Amino acid sequence: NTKYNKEFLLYLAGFVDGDGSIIAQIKPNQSYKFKHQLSLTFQVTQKTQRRWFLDKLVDEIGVGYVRDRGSVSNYILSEIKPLHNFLTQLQPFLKLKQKQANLVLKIIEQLPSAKESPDKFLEVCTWVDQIAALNDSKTRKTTSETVRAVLD
Amino acid sequence: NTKYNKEFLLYLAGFVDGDGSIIAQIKPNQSYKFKHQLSLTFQVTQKTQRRWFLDKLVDEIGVGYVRDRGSVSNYILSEIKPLHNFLTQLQPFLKLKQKQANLVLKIIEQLPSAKESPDKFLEVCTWVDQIAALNDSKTRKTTSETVRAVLD
DNA sequence: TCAAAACGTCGTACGACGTTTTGA
DNA sequence: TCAAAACGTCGTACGACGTTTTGA
Ligand SMILES: [Ca+2]
Ligand SMILES: [Ca+2]
Helix, strand or coil, X not given: CCCCCHHHHHHHHHHHHHHEEEEEEEEECCCCCCCEEEEEEEEEEEEHHHCHHHHHHHHHHCCXXXXXXXXXXXXXXXXXXXXXXXXXXXXXHCCCCHHHHHHHHXXXXXXXXXXXXXXXHHHHHHHHHHHHHHCCCCCCCCCHHHHHHHCX | CCCCCHHHHHHHHHHHHHHEEEEEEEEECCCCCCCEEEEEXXXXXXXXXXXXXXXXXXXXXXXXXXXXXXXXXXXEECCHHHHHHHHHHHCCCCCCCHHHHHHHHHHHHHHHHXXXXXXXXXXXXXXXXXXXXXXXXXXXXXXXXXXXXXXX
């Protein structure tokens, strides 16, 4: 697990607070025991003209990748482990998304545990609800109550 | 003439490269000698529910103000002397808007002598064109060319 | 005649999701 | 049965201008 330069974090933090997204989702999927997958994502969105800036992030952070889908590109970090190492370090400097950051850190630690009891799995999903609530959520379909109905 | 915390500037630089805008305008106005005003605005935009963010800014930057605009809010800094002192210290940390920052405070220095000679005023107007070109301009109506004609 | 503010608009550039598939 | 990638859209929340008024 790599240590990041504090000044790089201070900057990246403000910028993430600005163009970034801390996202958790309950993606429906029949190949899982609980018919759902828990998915975490850290992303930074930028017009493709400036994608050189995201490529830089991949180099500075040393993990993740950029993806261009036309007018905009996203930096993407989904690997559970480096994501923990990264948010852990970055979280202290966030001012607008610090709560979502920690909610994710907590969710990640409970992940191995959550895949045992369908109860503890459902509790974690309510943590995801808390993240979606702190975000500017507009197009959310699957929530904890979905998981609850299906678990029966 | 306050001096700003480096930790504060680093974070803000990132936030500005994200939700910030360094703007330069030539505003058609028949009360000005050259019938145009050179206007400079540093601004940060945010959804009104996070209005407290901008509000806190005003306290920490020391000048400027916030205005509610229906569903989003803005921190505005227009006062020419503070704008210069502030941008002078925030320029070294910016990554996406450093050039336009340098041009802005280069204008603010030529302002006094730009009100005498149209050739010196029309030159400064092409600096304003450079900023518009660096930014993601989309609705720009008045340019140095427009000022060029009107000065005939 | 000017700095500065007041107020108004437009077209994305983002955020924040969604599905389906990969590949151990 | 999983973590992680591939690939997709929605609805703004931003950015970046505009016009007009204020008041020394
Ligand atoms: Ca933002
Ligand atoms: Ca941006």
